[PDB]
Ligand binder design. Sequence first.
Ligand SMILES: Cc1cc(CO)c2cccc(NC(=O)CCC3CCNCC3)c2n1
Lengths: 39, 156
Amino acid sequence: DMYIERAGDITWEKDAEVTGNSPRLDVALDESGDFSLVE
Amino acid sequence: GETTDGVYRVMTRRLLGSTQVGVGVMQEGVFHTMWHVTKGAALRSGEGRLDPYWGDVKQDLVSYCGPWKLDAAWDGLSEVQLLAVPPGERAKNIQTLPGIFKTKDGDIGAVALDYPAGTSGSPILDKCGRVIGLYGNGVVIKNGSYVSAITQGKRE
Ligand SMILES: Cc1cc(CO)c2cccc(NC(=O)CCC3CCNCC3)c2n1
């Protein structure tokens, strides 16, 4: 049996750590909701 | 129980100790999370109960107590913030410029940030603090790193 606990506000934070690239990927989405790479 | 707007951890006592299985967003009395986190099961909030209202395995989303309320979308141009809520760790905002998932039915925003599986359901936000989608459904790229879609529902 599952339960929820608060973790914080949804607020944009100025001067947050900026990381992560922006790749463009060809993907497929199946009936089970699983994404896969198309090549 | 607690119905205050915000981000929440989804926990379970079924496995060893208290294990974090995912994260969700409380907005306008509705709890929003990914389907693979709860599998559509009911949730507890102190002594109160949250029952599922809408869900879809293909979209990998589920809402509790009411219809899906989150309707903001990525503008396709600006940076966003992943309000990552990792297991046993504090909520942390990470700023990134999203990539793109090109599909046969259109383009979806994507965030290339790698976090544990229990981080699934953490919200992605715009400069106004609006939730433009949830993190936790994606793919393993040619490098081995994880790239998640910016998964958003539809507000009826
Ligand atoms: C392999 C891996 C690694 C990491 C971390 O490095 C993940 C982090 C968050 C979330 C994941 N799962 C998914 O993206 C799939 C979820 C569901 C499965 C079955 N139903 C349709 C979506 C991670 N999958």
